[PDB]
């Protein structure tokens, strides 16, 4: 019996807290050494070091993408706390996060599966006895998205929910499970 890789789901633009607390054993006398690795899109051939602890000096020196955005939460990391914060979360930060503690001969490992969802925002409302199409196109966002159009059009009532009003012969509210959005359009015949 083992334990999986903790799954962490967060919203954009904010800070992920990854816990990695440890208790040293008497044997464990070697140099203390901590190393956090990011595994972009989880590709199993390569990981990258984001933050490292060694010679009792911290290093934020690498992964230029994360420059200035990742930090050990704790003050006294040696006291048995290796947890980190990841700040200003973006979609590129998606991946697999691993916590590696080494103090000869002891060693430990924790896997964290990070997920970054996006609150729907930036939706365009546009029109194209004609063959019209009314459109509520969002970006960025994430599925499953819901749409609700308003004003009392009868032959459109069915489309109230679909993101396209394929019209032939005032709002658009956009919602997922992390955020909402409002948009307005005009048409003329």
């Amino acid at each position: 019996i083992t334990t999986p890789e903790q799954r962490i789901e967060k919203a954009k633009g904010e800070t992920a807290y990854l816990p990695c607390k440890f208790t040293l054993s008497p044997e464990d006398q070697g140099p203390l050494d901590i190393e956090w690795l990011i595994s972009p899109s989880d590709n199993q051939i390569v990981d990258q070091v984001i933050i490292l602890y060694s010679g009792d000096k911290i290093y934020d020196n690498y992964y230029p993408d994360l420059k200035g955005r990742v930090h050990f939460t704790s003050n006294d990391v040696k006291s048995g706390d290796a947890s980190i914060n990841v700040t200003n979360l973006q979609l590129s930060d998606i991946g697999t996060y691993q916590c590696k503690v080494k103090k000869a001969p002891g060693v430990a490992n924790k896997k964290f599966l990070l997920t970054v969802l996006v609150k729907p925002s930036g939706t365009r409302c546009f029109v194209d006895g004609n063959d019209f199409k009314l459109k509520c196109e969002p970006k960025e966002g994430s599925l499953p998205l819901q749409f609700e159009w308003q004003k009392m059009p009868t032959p459109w009532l069915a489309e109230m929910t679909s993101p396209v009003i394929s019209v032939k012969n005032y709002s658009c509210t956009v919602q997922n499970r992390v955020g909402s959005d409002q948009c307005m359009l005009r048409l003329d015949v």
């Binding site: 050494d33 051939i45 690498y62 080494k102 000869a104 001969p105």
Partner: protein, 229 residues
């Protein structure tokens, strides 16, 4: 990458991050995992000039890779059936933030029998190797002979890359009738004995090295001549 080893023998699992230059290895983790099982255990880990073979591999695992030429290769000795699975090298080079993930699959075959039966006049191969994913890793091979209880020994054959004309054939009881069936460049030290005589009945003992690390094998060669009745 696959490897097949017989129980008792040794295996060298390569781990060579091939760049365009000499780079000092900063770290290696060798993890072991049984096929289709997410559980896994540390075999050997190395960091800041500190080598820590661990767990049930504590006595068996060595870091034989050259830490200056991008090499974190592992040597596992006295392989058992419980060693059957995937081994994963995780390696990082100094002044470099990239960690490399190289797996190798290890299959374990049943032990080779210690007893060997041959008829006078026969040519008989005697197996001895280190299975490896990397060439030219064996440094030295030494075959000794003896009906060996309270009795001295002889050199059957010996080779030593370290040295020039490294090949040495007994010239004793194995005058020009013993030679390598394979090549050491492929980390194989098997020999054949050409004309088996009764006088050859004893214990042959292979000793294959990667540097100071020894793997010993012993074969007991029986020889029979049919009296004709």
């Amino acid at each position: 990458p696959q490897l097949r080893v017989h129980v008792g023998e040794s295996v060298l699992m390569g781990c060579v991050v091939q760049r365009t230059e000499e780079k000092h290895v900063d770290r290696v983790d060798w993890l072991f995992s049984k096929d289709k099982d997410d559980a896994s255990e540390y075999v050997l880990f190395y960091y800041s000039n500190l080598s820590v073979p661990t767990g049930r591999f504590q006595n068996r695992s060595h870091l034989v890779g050259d830490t200056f030429h991008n090499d974190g290769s592992l040597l596992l000795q006295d392989v058992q059936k419980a060693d059957e699975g995937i081994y994963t090298c995780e390696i990082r080079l100094k002044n470099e933030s990239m960690v490399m993930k190289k797996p190798v699959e290890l299959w374990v075959l049943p032990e080779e029998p210690r007893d060997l039966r041959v008829r006078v006049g026969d040519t008989t191969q005697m197996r001895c190797s280190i299975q490896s994913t990397e060439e030219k890793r064996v440094t030295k091979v030494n075959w000794m002979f003896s009906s060996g209880s309270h009795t001295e020994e002889e050199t059957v054959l010996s080779y030593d890359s370290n040295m020039r004309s490294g090949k040495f054939q007994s010239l004793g009881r194995f005058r020009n009738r013993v030679d390598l069936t394979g090549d050491i460049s492929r980390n194989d030290g098997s020999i054949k004995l050409q004309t088996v005589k009764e006088s050859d009945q004893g214990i042959y003992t292979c000793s294959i090295y990667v540097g100071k690390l020894e793997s010993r094998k012993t074969i007991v060669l029986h020889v029979v001549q049919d009296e004709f009745q």
